[PDB]
Structure formats: C-alpha cells, structure tokens
Amino acid sequence: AALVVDNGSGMCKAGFAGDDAPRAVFPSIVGRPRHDSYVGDEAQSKRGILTLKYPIEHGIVTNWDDMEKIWHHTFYNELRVAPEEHPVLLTEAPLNPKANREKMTQIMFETFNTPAMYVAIQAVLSLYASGRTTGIVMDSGDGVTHTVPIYEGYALPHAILRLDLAGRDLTDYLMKILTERGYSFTTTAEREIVRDIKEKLCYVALDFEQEMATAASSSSLEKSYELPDGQVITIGNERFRCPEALFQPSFLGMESAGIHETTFNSIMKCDVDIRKDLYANTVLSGGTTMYPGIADRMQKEITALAPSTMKIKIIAPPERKYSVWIGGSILASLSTFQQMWISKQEYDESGPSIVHRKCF
Amino acid sequence: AALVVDNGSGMCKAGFAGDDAPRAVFPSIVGRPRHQGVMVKDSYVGDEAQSKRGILTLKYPIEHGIVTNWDDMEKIWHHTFYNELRVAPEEHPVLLTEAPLNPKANREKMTQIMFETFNTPAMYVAIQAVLSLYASGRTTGIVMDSGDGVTHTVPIYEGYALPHAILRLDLAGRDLTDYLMKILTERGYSFTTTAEREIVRDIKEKLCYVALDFEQEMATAASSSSLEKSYELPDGQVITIGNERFRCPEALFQPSFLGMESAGIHETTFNSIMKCDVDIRKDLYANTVLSGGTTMYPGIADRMQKEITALAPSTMKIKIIAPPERKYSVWIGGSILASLSTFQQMWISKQEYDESGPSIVHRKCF
Amino acid sequence: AALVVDNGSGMCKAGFAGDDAPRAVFPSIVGRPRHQGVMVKDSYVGDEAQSKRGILTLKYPIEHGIVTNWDDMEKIWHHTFYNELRVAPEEHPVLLTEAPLNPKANREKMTQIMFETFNTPAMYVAIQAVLSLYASGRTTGIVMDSGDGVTHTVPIYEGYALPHAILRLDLAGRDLTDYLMKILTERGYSFTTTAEREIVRDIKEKLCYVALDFEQEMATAASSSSLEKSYELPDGQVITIGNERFRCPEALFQPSFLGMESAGIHETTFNSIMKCDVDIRKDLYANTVLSGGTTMYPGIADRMQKEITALAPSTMKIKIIAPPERKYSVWIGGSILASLSTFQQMWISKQEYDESGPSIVHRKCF
Amino acid sequence: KVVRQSKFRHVFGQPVKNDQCYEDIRVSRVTWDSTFCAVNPKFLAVIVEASGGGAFLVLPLSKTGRIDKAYPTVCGHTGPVLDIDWCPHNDEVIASGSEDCTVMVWQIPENGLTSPLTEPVVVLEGHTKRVGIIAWHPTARNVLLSAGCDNVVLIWNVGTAEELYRLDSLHPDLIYNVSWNHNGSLFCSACKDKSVRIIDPRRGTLVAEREKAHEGARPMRAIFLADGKVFTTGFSRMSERQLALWDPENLEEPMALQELDSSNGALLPFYDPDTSVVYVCGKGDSSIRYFEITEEPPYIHFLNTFTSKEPQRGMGSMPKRGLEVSKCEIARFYKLHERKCEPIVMTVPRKSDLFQDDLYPDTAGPEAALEAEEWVSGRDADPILISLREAYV
Ligand SMILES: Nc1ncnc2c1ncn2[C@@H]1O[C@H](COP(=O)(O)OP(=O)(O)O)[C@@H](O)[C@H]1O
Ligand SMILES: Nc1ncnc2c1ncn2[C@@H]1O[C@H](COP(=O)(O)OP(=O)(O)O)[C@@H](O)[C@H]1O
Ligand SMILES: Nc1ncnc2c1ncn2[C@@H]1O[C@H](COP(=O)(O)OP(=O)(O)O)[C@@H](O)[C@H]1O
Ligand SMILES: [Mg+2]
Ligand SMILES: [Mg+2]
Ligand SMILES: [Mg+2]
C-alpha cells in the first residue's frame, strides 16, 4: 500500500495509491497561540487565538521545522499510518531546486524512515489524470503559477514559465478591495474567512468592462455571505474583480503578463512543429483554476493571441483541483513504476546523487 | 481665495490657501445632552461641545477613518464654514483631503455634499499622504501618517505612488487614549464617560513620550521617582502617573498590548518598503517622513530610527524626517498645492459635476 | 571631426574619430513609467532610465540584432548626439557600424534616418567584424564578436571577406542574462521585472567566469565554498552565488542548456573555418580574434583555445587573440578607419543620397 | 469664474477592446512624417510595406481581428506610398501620393477588395519628385491639391485629369504640410525655411507670410481653423516643442505660444471644427494631448492628456459622420502601432442618455457645394451642413 502526498502551498492532499480521491485534505497552516502549536484543521478550528503561518511561501520553504510538522500531521494525524511501512510518492514543483529536493529526501528517509520514496513533477502527474501525453499544463496553485509544455512524454524545461501570482495573491487582493466596501479583515484568522469567501462567490467574467457596467447599474450580481460570528456581508463587483488579477496582473502592481499570455508565451518558446498540438491540449490544474467561467475566458483570450487557423481547446476537468494527486495515485499503481522506487538502503549508502538522477 | 479643509478622525483643520497655519483647529466631536432641562440647541459641535462636555455625550462622526454617521458629519462641515471660518461656502472653492486607498463610495458622498448641500463653486480631493510630502518639499519618500483613527504608510517615488505597497494599521491616537484609561485604572484613577475621554486625551498629549529602550525605562521607573509627573484635573484634583507615560505610546511599537495581531509602526513602515521595487528602497530609507498628531511624542523619531535600522540592512542609511510642524503637515501641504499655478487645471466645477456626475471626480484624482 | 557610433543590442558607444576610447557609453534601452503620477517626461533613455528604473518598464529597441521598434531606435540616436556627445549631427560626418550579413532593408532605414531626420553631412556604414580587425592591426583572421543580441563568426583573409563562411549564433549576453535569472531562482533569489534584469546583468559582469573544465569545477563547487562570492543588491541585501558563476557562461559552449540545438561558440568558429578554402585555414587558426562584451569573461581565452585545439588537426597552431580592450574593439577600429587618409573617398554625401537614393549605399559597402 | 467655462475639460480616452482592433498589419517604415492612416465612415486605409513598389491596405471597418497576410492591397504604385486621403464627398474614392512622383486616385468596391487592385481610375502626373502631401478640397468637387519635394503645388481635377493651377515660385524649400481653410479659398503651408504662408490658389499670390514662426530646425506643421486663424506646432531654438496661434491680419506676434516638452518627433495636429478642439499627437510618442481653441486668453487651454504605453507610428481621425452619437462621441482615433491598428475612443462624460444638442452642431456633409468648373470661375461657398440627430439610436 503506497502513499501519495502532494504538498502544496496552502493545501496538502494525502491518500493511498489506487484510490480516486484524496482521503486527507487539510490546509498547510501552522498556528501558535498569541495570548504549543496547531497544524491543519486543528489550527483552523482554534484560529480565534492562533497566529496562522504558511510554511510554504511562493513554493519556497521558509521554515523546515514547521514543514516537518505538516508531514508529521499527514502520517500520524490524518492518514493514521506508519511512514516506515508504506512507500510514499512525493510531488515537486517544476524546475524544483536540487537543494529543495534533497531536504525532502533527507527528511523522509531520516526522520520518517520511509522504506521507498519517489519525487515526481506536479505538471507531469496533472497530465496523467487527463489521460494525455501531449499538452501544456497550466497549474496555478496557492503560491506560484507554472506553464509546463509536454510533447509525447518529453519535457521542455527551456519553455517552462513561472508566474508569481496565485491563490494567495488573489486572497490578499480580495482583502484590499473588501475594505473599499467597509469590511476590514486584517488578522491571519480573517485571511481564511476571505479565502473561504473567494472559493464560494468569486468567478471569472467573460468580459470585464461589460461586467462592470451591469454591476454598476443593476443588483443582479450581488451575493450574501455569512461570517462565523453571524453578520451577513454582501459583495458586488468584488466577485469578479479579484479573479481578474489572473488576467491583469497590473491590478496588483505587477509588471508581468497575465496567465493567458504566460500560457501563450510558453507555447511560443516551443518548437514550431509542436505548437499546433499544444494549442489543442491546454490543461488546467490547481485550485486557482476552479473559478466558474475561467475556461471560457481562457479560450477567448488565447484565441485572440493564437493564429486563426489553430484550434484552441482548454481542457478543464471538473476534478482538476486534485489532478496532481489523482495523477500520482495512477502512477503509484502502474506496474511499470516499481523500478522508479528509491530504497532507503540505497540512499544511505549513495546519498542524494541517486535522487537527482532517476528524476526530472 | 481657496479653502483647505482637512477633516481627520479626531481633529478638523481649516484655513485659507496661502497661509502657513490652519486658522481653525477644533475637535471633530458632536455632543448631545443626556439630562433633562429644568430652566426655561439639541447638539453642539467643536469647541462649544468641549466646554459643555460635563452634561453632553460626545460622539465622533469618524471612527477608524470611516464615517459612522453622515448627519453629524455635515454638522462638522457646517460648523467649519459658518462658525469657525465664517465664510460663505458658495463663494470659495474647497480643497479636500482623503485617506489613502479611500473607498470610492466615501469619496462620492464627500463631493456630493459639497456640491449639493453647501453649493461650493469648485472642489478637489487629494491624498493626505501626498500633501504631507509637499510640506517637506520632497518628491520621493515614504509617508507614515498617524492621526486619530488609522495609520497609513504610503511610499512615493519621484511623484509616483505605489498603491500596492500601501499598508494600513488600525491603531492611532484614539486607541492609545483608550489604552491609557485601562492602565490608569491600575493606579486607582477611573475614567469612563465620554466627557472624561478628552481629559485622558489631554493627559496623553502633555505627559506621554516614547522611550528609547522600553525595558530599561521600566527598570528606571520601578526604582526611582524621577519619571513621575503630576497633572491637574479640571476639578482641581492632582493625579500622578509613573510608567504609564511611556507605556501608552509603546502600543504603537508593540500592538500586542492591545491584543492586536498586527505588527508595530516600525515594522509596518519596513514592510511597506519591502513591498516596493528593490531599486527604490534606498531612497525610501533616507526619506521616511512622519505625519499626524500621533507622531508628536517626544523621542518617537529616535526610537523609529533605531528600530528600522535593526530591520534594514547595515549598508542602508536610515533618515527619519520629523519636522516640528508635522501635526499640520497635511494642511500645510494642502495650502501649498492650492496656491501653485499648475493646480488650477485640477478644479472640478459644480456645473461640470451636475452634467457628468461622480465619474469625473474618480478621474482627475488618485 | 568625424563621429563613430557603434549601435549594439545592449550598449551604444559613441565618440570622435581619432580618440582611443568612446566618449559616451550608455545602455541602449528606453524606459516608460508604469505607475501614475500623483504630484506635479514620458520616456527615459540611456543612463537616465537606469537611475529611475524602479518605476519604469525597460525595453530594448534592438533584439537579436533586429530593430523591433524604430520609434525607440531614433530616441537612442537622438540621445547620443544631443545629450551624450552634445554635438550637432548636421555638422559632423557619422560612421555607423552594422552587423555582418545585415538585411538591405535595415541598412536602408539606418541611412534614411541619418540623412533626413538628423541631416548628417556625410555618412558611411562599416562591418563590425571588419572594424574589429582594424583595432588589432591585422588583415587576416576570423573574428568571433559576441555582443548582447547575436554572435557572429566572420573569417577574413588578406582583406577579403568570405560571406559564404559567415555563421550566426542566436546566443549572446542577453540570453545569458535570462539564463542566469532562471538559475538564480534555484538559490532562492527571484528576479522577474525588467528593472531586476539590469541587476542580474551587473552580477553577470562581475562574478561570472568561464571554467577551463566545466565538470571538474562542478565537483569543486559541490565540495567546497572557495568559489562562492557575495554581491550587494541596491537595497543593501547581500546575495551569495556559487556554481552559478560558471554555469551561466558555460551556456556559450553548451547551447543545449537553453534548449537550443545549435553548436557552441567554439564549434561555430571551427565550422566557419572549415567552410573556407583549405589553403587559408592555417592563417585563420592562428588569428582568431575575440570581440564584444560577451567575450570579456575571465578564462574565456584558454577555454576557447582548449576546445578549438581538440577540434583542429594536431599540427595546426591555435592562437586566440583576446586584447584587453576587446569590449570596444569595434569602436576603436572605427576610430582608426575614420582617421585614415585613404578613407575620405568612402564618405557618402547627403546631396548624393538625395539625388541617387539608397542604390549608392548598397554599393561602396560590403 | 474660478474654473474656465468649457464642455470638454473632462474628455477622456479609452482604447477599444482587442477583438475590435486590426492585427497583423505590416505598417509602413517610411521615414516621411505623414499620418500613415486615412479613415472614413466606410473603410480604413493604412499604408503598408510591399515587397516591390508601394501599396496601402484598404479594409472595411467591420473586418476586425487578425488580418490575413495575403489580404488584397492597393498595389499600383512603383514606389512606396507616402500619403493617403479619402474623398470627403465620396466614401469609396481615395487619392494617394508615392515615391514615383505620381498621384493616383482609386475606386474601392462597396464590399472592399477581393483581388489586389492595380489599375487606378486616373493617374495624376505633374511632379518631378516624390509627392507626400495630398489634400482634397473641402467643398469643390473633384478638386485635389498635390505638393511634392520639388516645391511646387498643383491643383488637380480628378474628374478630367486636368491641372487647374501650378504654384512653383512660392516655396523655396521643402513643404511640410498643406491644409485648406474652412471654405477652401486659401491654404496654409509650413516650409523647411521656418516660414508659414497663406496662399490663394486661384490668384497665385501670397496673401500672408510669417518668417521664423518657430526657431527650431525640426519640422513644423500648420492648419487652418474654422474662424480663419492658423494653428502651428513647431520647435524653439532650445529644441522645445511649441504650439502657436496666428492671426492672418497681424502676423507680427502670435496670440499664444505654449511649450509642451523636450521630445523628438513632429507634432501632428488634428483639428475638430465643431468642438474647436485640436488634438496634438507626436510621432513616436505614447500620449495624446488635446487643447480647446477659444477667444478668451490665452486662447489655448490645455484640457487633458490621454496616456498609453506604446509609441504611435501613425494616426487617423474619423470624420463627424462616422462616430456613434448615442455614447457622447466627439472623436475616434485609429492609433497605428508597428503591427496593429488600435481605435481610440474619446467621450464626454454625461449622465443623460439622450441626444446632446450642444455636443453635436451641424457638420460638413458628404455633398459637395460647388463644382470644379464653378470653383475656378471665382465662386466661394461654405460646406453643406447635415444633422447627426438622425444617427442617434
Ligand atoms: N472552488 C474554488 N474557487 C476558487 N478558488 C479556489 C477554489 N478552491 C480552492 N481555491 C484556491 O486555490 C488555491 C490553491 O489550491 P491548491 O490547488 O490546492 O494549491 P496547492 O497546489 O498549493 O495545494 C487556494 O488558495 C484556494 O484559495
Ligand atoms: N503633542 C501631542 N502628543 C501626543 N499626541 C498628540 C499630540 N497632539 C495630538 N495628539 C494626538 O493625535 C491624534 C490625532 O491628531 P491629528 O493628527 O490631528 O489626527 P487627524 O489627522 O485625524 O485630525 C489626537 O487624538 C491626539 O490625541
Ligand atoms: N566584464 C564583463 N563580463 C561579462 N559580461 C560582460 C562584461 N562586460 C560586458 N558584458 C556583457 O556584454 C554584453 C554586450 O556588450 P557589447 O559587446 O557592448 O554588446 P553590443 O555589441 O550589442 O553593444 C552586455 O549585455 C554585458 O552583459
Ligand atoms: Mg499544486
Ligand atoms: Mg490626518
Ligand atoms: Mg557589437
């Protein structure tokens, strides 16, 4: 029985190989009292007196001691399994620094004593869940957004683009614009409330300027949300202004281009002979791509950029929030994957030189 | 002659363009009687409410920089034009000030009242952090204003503002005044009524200061009486305060004293700079400008320089610019801007607003 | 007094004929503000855009040796004559430099701008590779000039150029600067904005070097800290880089690092020699001349000599000539050529161009 | 009293959405400082690069989005095209001057071009050098003006291919631009000798002249206003771009002289006679400044500036008949990038959704008042005015 653990910036999904959905999904949050530590949903329930901190910021480890707490919470508190009795499949961000991968390998083999372990690129696993071997995966998670083109199973690192704009930036932007309506959220506890608001009432408009016009001359686009303490707040144009930062990073003062142009630019960096198939296999992944209407807006924007003769097809499966995890479960069940396993007895005699190879 | 009106959470400064100091500085309070009249005006605004506060219930129309009740807000403006300045608002254009990242709904009400209720011929709204930079004669610097309701840190580089780097702190003079009461009951003095709010606030403005080393100042105050001062209450009673002089302003640097999770003003200023581009952080370190009445404590500049230096890299030069008239920096900057010959193209006519609406005031402003 | 202007992809060097160094060396960028002005010039070029780059979006008008925007290109030239050289273009002959195998359309635009926009009295266009040979005092040799946009290998024998043997490599300083940014994120440092591109370029010019043996240094850097250097960011932050010092310049010899299938600069130089006649290959092996800023990395001469020797026959003598002033070899060669008594016959008058057109500049040139 | 009375102090620019732009257009790379764009309520004409000779792209306004690289173009000239201009009295007739020293007038089908157009209706040959200035007469039908680098101005009859008048001994240097007056009896010209001239073509005499209107050596422009005044843009001795208003009755000193900035590139003014608003647009600049011409001093009131991030290579202005009145339109500008044509929307912010009588006075119509034969005889007439209220939806 193999374990699949996909460590994201905000959510850490864990489960067992061969399953269809993650058995354990909890926020990657370490909370400490401000009036000795709480991790995950136990921090989420007591966040009234806790100072919530994310151990991952922009896909970068800021505190490895908190990271071990997240992993300790997965094995013993959520999965309820012994890490030394199950092979564990890890997921890594594209262009993952070899220093970051080594620490992941070192912790798993020395602190948790796992028998077998393997690290896979999140973009590759996202394509397995869709049953494809060719296409560009735009995985937008909590910390960072990546565009990884893939052709016939071959990865092209030179065409991988990174956008420092993801779910956390949208959540912080929603708080900034919510004060324009009169609701003030400042503490880290209120960040989760705003994030909960973003996941329920936000959506991507097909056109932004027109959506401003109807929201400024009609009350059909307003929705009501209930706070934990009972006050009901209403939001109008903030529903689609927050996700618009994905396509217009200038709202956040950022100079880089939107996630539609980043996807197009990553294709433009590929060879000419493969661009046609990448246009027709644009795969969305991550929780930041779960906004209603994000697929239609993506298709309209990329079509305006791509030549008229190319068929833009945005693939947005309904379970794309767990595509990375689902792809990991399928890999951990394939018969051809057993030769990818890295043994503990192999690591202690060889070191991280064997994990830098046998991986990508 | 243009009018410059700076309506803060606690104080409202008004005057004429071209002057060096506000002509009218009165508290932004509205008082209503709480007893019954037995001997043969239902509200008082400004100094007249402060003098009769013994029988009134003082209410601040602005709290945390948001206007709680607009009906008393119009009374503040009405008192300003007719009773303090004693001018006709329909004759002089009015230059108004707004907090950074002001909601467009709040700005819309502010201009609509001016054009419809007071019938001002022209009107304009400017960001308070911008005028505070005009008073110091600079084009680059991070302005940390601290008034009565809220604290803003606005970095500006070469006349370009960075809205994404603007940070807010829900901690200002009113919160410190409330905190001083909580620690004053420790010494045996009880202040509870809104009338006593102005008494405690007056104590804070006269006896409080910022200690360079907070832990050392506790050690000195716990073993000596050199730090004790005496204050006379309006009824003639004399009270003495010790370590409360510098414990109250310490909430600005340690918001945990109020149970707040946010960081202090020194870290908020530092975090605002780090949100800017790397190539402009060098100038922002050497052009830190203080503004507002809450930055008038003795020794606040020295403590600010020490704290930011410990956070900033050693090779950067930290300069805390604290002009002695920083309590009126926003108004002084407003008078300077309203007198420049290049500002007459920014006025918004009453006629133009009638035919166009608030669409033209959202533009032409920032 | 003739003017020698060398317009490169990243830098523009200008001066007067007869001098030994360019009087004006400024980056060839155009910067435009990316924020809004909140207090009382829409474009910045040259060093002025470098000092204000924290609030501008820097664009290179020349990309891969191709002018992407002629409206920005004329700004660079206007800055050169009026702001850097501070001279009137209509009073001095201007000697321009062009890339090898330059498109005839590009040369047409360059000639047209000088004669109608700046109204230069005389003008001539010279091949950058030929000028680089003038500065070294040679008439025979293969010039491998690597600038910011494109790498060229031009063999010249006894004053005769071999156009069929000229090879082009789309890999230069700008491609290395982008590659250094990608690998710096592996160490935790994030540079994304165009303003941060210049900072990374500054790091590349100071701490990068070419390893004599790439693999043996990777083992040294992974088992020692002797190759680690520290760099100070403009905001005072200090970054440390290790193996990235020689991994970025290694991309010149291993273009597969950037996903490019073309050969390295060592093989491109060797392939260009093999494309010439057999009789002249001996002289080109002993007169390999380096030029451009991308060949200024310490230890690039020995690595080039080591690689070419492994490709060339054992009896051939490989001699890489890398003068210490090779960063300005194109300009210095231009100054030498513009001062020769036999060069005045090559000038093209404005009156001649007005009555004859661009047919006369395609001739009289190469 | 505090604020100058005006209706356009709050006019703001707004670029049109991407799907309504025109992409993949090989915009011309000719150093000549022309508008590079001519637009009428029916078609859009853009000067493009051709492999050989010269051509300009004419496409219907509805043909938005990306444009085929093989889209048919008007490729009849043997040299690059310099200037294009639609016929004010015929929406399917456009004249073009090019490097081949010839002026060609074309007839565009109602649906546009299905095949490349090579044969013109009439070929105007009267010049020895390149023709870069073409200006249709505002009221005279089939009367066209051509000015070339040979410093000669010709009056053409496109109906009969007849040269009416030849003006050769009036410009000693290069001609920058030529603009007719309101009734088309005179025309102003800016010359390379820094002199502004007002010339009567019928009589062939110099009505007025101002030497050293701008001290700078950089190119300058000059247009005629509705009231008969001349608005000129130029450079000072310190390379400062300036605007100036001139009175033909006394040219000793200008009524106004305002400096803008220290950038390069000529200033191309776009005058709107109904609103008395001049739009000053610089070649290669990324901003558009518009000023209101009035009788109150300083006679030039800066209104506001539209700012963008892309330099402009060309710009064309839609006439009054083509704007959509229902949304308070006063001007629509087709800003030209290097590979894209982006329409620009300028509106007056108004709360009322009804037709605005004050914003839209009667405009010159597509009906010519006089004819070529009557104009030569000595007749002068103002353009026939029409009402835009019928265009309100
Ligand atoms: N239904 C939803 N709509 C919009 N955003 C969502 C939704 N569900 C989750 N998100 C956002 O997606 C972000 C990242 O989710 P996820 O893809 O799990 O990130 P990671 O890959 O780092 O685990 C979260 O910050 C969350 O706010
Ligand atoms: N000399 C002083 N020392 C300490 N605090 C002061 C002093 N003067 C004023 N304050 C405090 O500053 C607060 C706000 O003053 P001000 O800067 O006018 O705010 P606003 O901008 O809201 O009008 C007041 O509540 C007052 O308590
Ligand atoms: N000492 C140096 N070390 C490494 N790179 C350098 C050095 N000096 C200049 N360069 C690089 O050379 C590049 C181009 O310089 P240059 O030869 O002037 O190009 P061009 O010919 O296009 O003007 C610059 O981008 C710069 O990064
Ligand atoms: Mg993820
Ligand atoms: Mg204030
Ligand atoms: Mg060069």
From Swiss-Prot, chain A:
Pfam family, one: Actin
Designated name of the protein: Actin, cytoplasmic 1
Consequence when changing Q122H: In CSMH; uncertain significance; somatic variant
Disease in which the protein is involved: Dystonia-deafness syndrome 1: An autosomal dominant form of dystonia with juvenile onset, associated with congenital or childhood-onset sensorineural deafness. Dystonia is defined by the presence of sustained involuntary muscle contraction, often leading to abnormal postures. Some DDS1 patients have dysmorphic features, skeletal anomalies, and/or mild developmental delay with impaired intellectual development. Baraitser-Winter syndrome 1: A rare developmental disorder characterized by the combination of congenital ptosis, high-arched eyebrows, hypertelorism, ocular colobomata, and a brain malformation consisting of anterior-predominant lissencephaly. Other typical features include postnatal short stature and microcephaly, intellectual disability, seizures, and hearing loss.
Annotated positions of the N6-methyllysine modification: K69
Result, substituting G131A: In CSMH; somatic variant
Record-listed cross-link (Microbial infection) Isoglutamyl lysine isopeptide (Glu-Lys) (interchain with K-50), residues: E255
Subunit structure: Polymerization of globular actin (G-actin) leads to a structural filament (F-actin) in the form of a two-stranded helix. Each actin can bind to 4 others. Identified in a IGF2BP1-dependent mRNP granule complex containing untranslated mRNAs. Component of the BAF complex, which includes at least actin (ACTB), ARID1A, ARID1B/BAF250, SMARCA2, SMARCA4/BRG1, ACTL6A/BAF53, ACTL6B/BAF53B, SMARCE1/BAF57 SMARCC1/BAF155, SMARCC2/BAF170, SMARCB1/SNF5/INI1, and one or more of SMARCD1/BAF60A, SMARCD2/BAF60B, or SMARCD3/BAF60C. In muscle cells, the BAF complex also contains DPF3.
A biological-process GO annotation: negative regulation of cell differentiation
Phenotypic consequence of I56A: Decreased interaction with SETD3
PTM text: ISGylated.
PANTHER family linked: ACTIN
Enzyme class, broadest EC rank: hydrolase
UniProt keyword Cytoplasm present: yes
Gene3D superfamilies per the UniProt record, alphabetical: 3.30.420.40, Actin, Chain A, domain 4
Gene (UniProt): ACTB
Resulting phenotype, Y54A: Decreased interaction with SETD3
UniProtKB/Swiss-Prot annotation, chains B, C:
Catalyzed reaction equations: ATP + H2O = ADP + phosphate + H(+)
Effect after changing R138C: In BNS and CSMH; also found in isolated non-syndromic Becker nevi; somatic variant
Phenotype when changing W70E: Does not affect methylation by SETD3
Cross-link ((Microbial infection) Isoglutamyl lysine isopeptide (Glu-Lys) (interchain with K-50)): E261
Name this protein carries in UniProt: Actin, cytoplasmic 1
UniProt-reported outcome of changing G65A: Impaired methylation by SETD3
E.C. designation(s): 3.6.4.-
InterPro entries: Actin, Actin/actin-like_CS, Actin_CS, ATPase_NBD
Chief localization: cytoplasm
Pfam family, one: Actin
Family per similarity comment: Belongs to the actin family.
PTM: ISGylated.
CDD domains: ASKHA_NBD_actin
Modified residues (N6-methyllysine): K75
Clinical condition linked: Dystonia-deafness syndrome 1: An autosomal dominant form of dystonia with juvenile onset, associated with congenital or childhood-onset sensorineural deafness. Dystonia is defined by the presence of sustained involuntary muscle contraction, often leading to abnormal postures. Some DDS1 patients have dysmorphic features, skeletal anomalies, and/or mild developmental delay with impaired intellectual development. Baraitser-Winter syndrome 1: A rare developmental disorder characterized by the combination of congenital ptosis, high-arched eyebrows, hypertelorism, ocular colobomata, and a brain malformation consisting of anterior-predominant lissencephaly. Other typical features include postnatal short stature and microcephaly, intellectual disability, seizures, and hearing loss.
GO biological process, one term: regulation of nucleotide-excision repair
Modified residues (Tele-methylhistidine): H64
Annotated keywords: Acetylation, ATP-binding, Cytoplasm, Cytoskeleton, Deafness, Disease variant, Dystonia, Hydrolase, Intellectual disability, Isopeptide bond, Methylation, Nucleotide-binding, Nucleus, Oxidation, Ubl conjugation
From Swiss-Prot, chain D:
Entry keyword annotation includes Disulfide bond: no
Subcellular location: Cytoplasm, Cytoskeleton; Cytoplasm, Cytoskeleton, Stress fiber
Primary location class: cytoplasm
Record's keyword terms, sorted: Actin-binding, Coiled coil, Cytoplasm, Cytoskeleton, Phosphoprotein, Repeat, WD repeat
GO biological process assignments: actin cytoskeleton organization; actin filament branching; actin filament bundle assembly; actin filament organization; cell migration; cellular response to platelet-derived growth factor stimulus; endothelial cell chemotaxis; negative regulation of Arp2/3 complex-mediated actin nucleation
Post-translational modification: Phosphorylation does not seem to affect subcellular location.
GO CC aspect terms: actin filament; cell leading edge; cell periphery; cytoplasm; cytosol; extracellular exosome; focal adhesion; glutamatergic synapse
WD repeat residues: 14-68, 69-118, 119-162, 163-206, 207-252, 253-292
MF (Gene Ontology): actin filament binding; Arp2/3 complex binding; cadherin binding; identical protein binding
Domain of life: Eukaryota
Subunit comment: Forms homooligomers, but does not form complexes with the other coronins. Interacts with Arp2/3 complex components, including ACTR2, ARPC1B and ARPC2. Binds actin.
Similarity remark: Belongs to the WD repeat coronin family.
Protein purpose: Regulates leading edge dynamics and cell motility in fibroblasts. May be involved in cytokinesis and signal transduction.
Protein name per the record: Coronin-1B
Organism: Homo sapiens
Gene: CORO1B
